[PDB]
Design a protein around this motif. Structure first.
Motif, PDB file in Angstrom:
ATOM      1  N   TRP A 197      14.334   0.127  -4.184  1.00 31.27           N
ATOM      2  CA  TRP A 197      13.925  -1.268  -4.069  1.00 31.27           C
ATOM      3  C   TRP A 197      15.066  -2.191  -3.666  1.00 31.27           C
ATOM      4  O   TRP A 197      14.808  -3.268  -3.120  1.00 31.27           O
ATOM      5  CB  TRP A 197      13.330  -1.759  -5.389  1.00 31.27           C
ATOM      6  N   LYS A 199      10.502  -8.983  -8.311  1.00 33.46           N
ATOM      7  CA  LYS A 199       9.415  -9.705  -7.658  1.00 33.46           C
ATOM      8  C   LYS A 199       9.464 -11.194  -7.978  1.00 33.46           C
ATOM      9  O   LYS A 199       9.158 -12.028  -7.118  1.00 33.46           O
ATOM     10  CB  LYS A 199       8.066  -9.116  -8.070  1.00 33.46           C
ATOM     11  N   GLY A 239      11.833 -13.535  -5.899  1.00 38.77           N
ATOM     12  CA  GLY A 239      11.501 -13.691  -4.500  1.00 38.77           C
ATOM     13  C   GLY A 239      12.004 -12.591  -3.593  1.00 38.77           C
ATOM     14  O   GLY A 239      11.817 -12.686  -2.374  1.00 38.77           O
ATOM     15  N   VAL A 240      12.636 -11.555  -4.143  1.00 41.54           N
ATOM     16  CA  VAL A 240      13.135 -10.452  -3.328  1.00 41.54           C
ATOM     17  C   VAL A 240      11.952  -9.719  -2.710  1.00 41.54           C
ATOM     18  O   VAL A 240      11.032  -9.291  -3.416  1.00 41.54           O
ATOM     19  CB  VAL A 240      14.002  -9.504  -4.163  1.00 41.54           C
ATOM     20  N   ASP A 241      11.968  -9.579  -1.388  1.00 39.09           N
ATOM     21  CA  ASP A 241      10.893  -8.877  -0.702  1.00 39.09           C
ATOM     22  C   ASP A 241      10.936  -7.391  -1.036  1.00 39.09           C
ATOM     23  O   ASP A 241      12.003  -6.773  -1.064  1.00 39.09           O
ATOM     24  CB  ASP A 241      10.996  -9.083   0.807  1.00 39.09           C
ATOM     25  N   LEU A 242       9.760  -6.817  -1.293  1.00 42.70           N
ATOM     26  CA  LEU A 242       9.653  -5.420  -1.684  1.00 42.70           C
ATOM     27  C   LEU A 242       8.795  -4.580  -0.751  1.00 42.70           C
ATOM     28  O   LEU A 242       8.970  -3.358  -0.722  1.00 42.70           O
ATOM     29  CB  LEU A 242       9.089  -5.306  -3.111  1.00 42.70           C
ATOM     30  N   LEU A 243       7.884  -5.187   0.006  1.00 46.08           N
ATOM     31  CA  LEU A 243       7.027  -4.480   0.952  1.00 46.08           C
ATOM     32  C   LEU A 243       7.393  -4.824   2.393  1.00 46.08           C
ATOM     33  O   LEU A 243       6.532  -4.903   3.270  1.00 46.08           O
ATOM     34  CB  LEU A 243       5.556  -4.788   0.685  1.00 46.08           C
ATOM     35  N   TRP A 244       8.686  -5.026   2.649  1.00 42.71           N
ATOM     36  CA  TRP A 244       9.166  -5.429   3.965  1.00 42.71           C
ATOM     37  C   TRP A 244       9.024  -4.337   5.015  1.00 42.71           C
ATOM     38  O   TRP A 244       9.182  -4.626   6.206  1.00 42.71           O
ATOM     39  CB  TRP A 244      10.632  -5.858   3.871  1.00 42.71           C
ATOM     40  N   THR A 245       8.736  -3.098   4.612  1.00 41.90           N
ATOM     41  CA  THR A 245       8.633  -1.987   5.548  1.00 41.90           C
ATOM     42  C   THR A 245       7.219  -1.745   6.053  1.00 41.90           C
ATOM     43  O   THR A 245       7.052  -1.067   7.072  1.00 41.90           O
ATOM     44  CB  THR A 245       9.155  -0.699   4.901  1.00 41.90           C
ATOM     45  N   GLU A 253       5.280  -3.878   7.432  1.00 43.01           N
ATOM     46  CA  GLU A 253       5.097  -4.574   8.700  1.00 43.01           C
ATOM     47  C   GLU A 253       5.760  -3.829   9.850  1.00 43.01           C
ATOM     48  O   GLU A 253       5.338  -3.974  11.002  1.00 43.01           O
ATOM     49  CB  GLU A 253       5.643  -5.997   8.606  1.00 43.01           C
TER      50      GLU A 253
END
Length: 345
Positions: free
Chosen positions: A77, A222, A225-231, A233
């Motif tokens: 993560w 989460k 604000g840390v992006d976790l599903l950035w992959t 896209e």
């Protein structure tokens, strides 16, 4: 520090291109290596064989594998790693120079971050434990035995690294770091002797602490604000065929499997069906162990074909936990008890 990352990524792309061009007739071998290196095999084949052979290598193997999975999942993560198949088409390094050609296979397109490289790590740790335990035995032509085993270990590691690099799913530094991390985890667990004679209380508390820490860390990441599903896209527009991308709706699929395996081992070790068949039994001879191994392997292979439904998250999680916990119970307490009763006549 973007220049170093770009240099490493370009070197990875060059290696992938070189391997994909000069080695055309090695697709099947690399696919086989990549599919055998799954940890399901470690939890379904390598553990029942070793537990009935030494009774102590299996415990260390399972602990090392579970902790390696936990560390890989936690660091996934935050490491923020990228995979070669979408970096080449979504970069700016090749803006005035020809873009290298990369070929994608049905195994290439993946949805998760690729920084920890959770394929070489588990294999490295498990096989290091197995080799060290094997050389611990037969201690008393030993120099000739050492080198063959170490050459085999390094040949397996190199094959796994090349298989992951060839399919355009990782960079060399990620896989090398994964191998080193697996070796470090195995060596760290080589120095712990309090994981053998432990009651159910310790197992339950450790599992609860691991689950709570993972969930709390995920929620804390989460919240900030840390992006976790950035992959998700990226593995949707840079994949050549949409059929090759399988979206995941269960982010906690493997953590519960690992906790289930740990708790199942804890339950199986502390049971009456265990200290009556595998321990303190008159009819304990090598054919009995061989029969137990064969029966466990066959029945586990048959049982693996049960797929819990994924329609409901809670039901899926509970069923995955239960099915992962069933394997140690069946392999340790249930099956050997039945063979002891039937064959004891």
């Amino acid at each position: 520090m973007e220049e170093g990352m770009n240099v490493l990524h370009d070197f990875g792309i060059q290696s992938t291109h070189y391997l994909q061009v000069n080695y055309q007739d090695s697709q099947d071998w690399f696919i086989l290596v990549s599919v055998i290196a799954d940890l399901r095999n470690a939890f379904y084949v390598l553990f029942p064989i070793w537990f009935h052979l030494q009774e102590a290598v299996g415990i260390k193997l399972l602990w090392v594998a579970v902790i390696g999975d936990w560390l890989n999942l936690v660091f996934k993560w935050i490491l923020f790693g990228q995979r070669p198949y979408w970096w080449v088409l979504d970069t700016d390094y090749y803006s005035n120079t020809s873009v290298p050609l990369i070929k994608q296979f049905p195994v290439t397109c993946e949805t998760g971050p690729g920084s920890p490289s959770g394929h070489a790590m588990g294999t490295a740790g498990v096989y290091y434990v197995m080799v060290t335990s094997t050389l611990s035995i037969f201690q008393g032509r030993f120099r000739c035995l050492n080198v063959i085993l170490w050459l085999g270990f390094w040949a397996v590691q190199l094959n796994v690294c090349l298989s992951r690099i060839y399919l355009a799913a990782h960079f060399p530094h990620q896989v090398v770091a994964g191998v080193l991390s697996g070796i470090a985890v195995a060596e760290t667990f080589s120095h712990i002797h309090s994981i053998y004679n432990a009651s159910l209380k310790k197992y339950f508390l450790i599992t609860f602490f691991l689950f709570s820490f993972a969930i709390g860390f995920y929620l804390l990441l989460k919240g900030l604000g840390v992006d976790l599903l950035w992959t998700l896209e990226k593995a949707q527009r840079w994949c050549e065929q949409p059929e090759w991308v399988h979206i995941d709706t269960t982010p906690f699929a493997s953590l519960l499997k690992n906790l289930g395996t740990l708790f199942g081992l804890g339950l199986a070790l502390n049971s009456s069906m265990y200290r009556e068949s595998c321990k303190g039994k008159l009819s304990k001879w090598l054919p009995f162990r061989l029969s137990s191994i064969v029966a466990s392997l066959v029945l586990l292979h048959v049982f693996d074909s049960l797929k819990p439904p994924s329609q409901v998250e809670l039901v899926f999680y509970v069923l995955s936990f239960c099915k992962s916990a069933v394997v140690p119970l069946a392999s340790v307490s249930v099956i050997p008890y039945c063979l002891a009763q039937v064959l004891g006549q």
